[PDB]
């Protein structure tokens, strides 16, 4: 009974590292990523920050648990697993890779990787 695209990306973990000349982040230890109804979970994430663009940075997650879950009020859960995941800021691209699996009311697929957009 709340929005998911309505809410900011919440992130937490126990290691955090940045470099302004390396232009890159590290987080480490059970990284939890959430927005409203969406739950996404890894052990590490990577993001390159060029700067000069604004909002073209991408959030590449890896290491177990490497799981996705969502619950809609509209009787529509969806959940899945992989080894590696690409997540992003608005629509830009999405893919799950390494033993990827996904299930929903009108949708059932599994393999090395799943093709599905935002």
């Amino acid at each position: 009974v709340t929005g998911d695209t309505d809410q900011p990306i919440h992130i937490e973990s126990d290691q955090q590292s940045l470099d302004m000349q390396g232009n890159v982040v590290t987080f480490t230890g059970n990284v939890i990523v959430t927005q409203g109804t969406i739950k996404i979970n890894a052990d590490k994430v990577v993001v390159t920050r060029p700067g000069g663009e604004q909002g073209k940075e991408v959030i590449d997650g890896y290491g177990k648990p490497a799981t996705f879950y969502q619950m809609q009020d509209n009787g529509k859960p969806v959940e899945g697993h992989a080894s590696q995941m690409h997540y992003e800021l608005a629509k830009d691209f999405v893919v799950l890779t390494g033993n990827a699996y996904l299930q929903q009311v009108d949708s059932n697929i599994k393999g090395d990787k799943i093709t599905y957009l935002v």
Binding site: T5, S13, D14, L18, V25
Partner: peptide
Amino acid sequence: VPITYVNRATXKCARY
């Protein structure tokens, strides 16, 4: 949607 995190190892948060 904005990127925001909380640091377990100090007590406080950031955007990046």
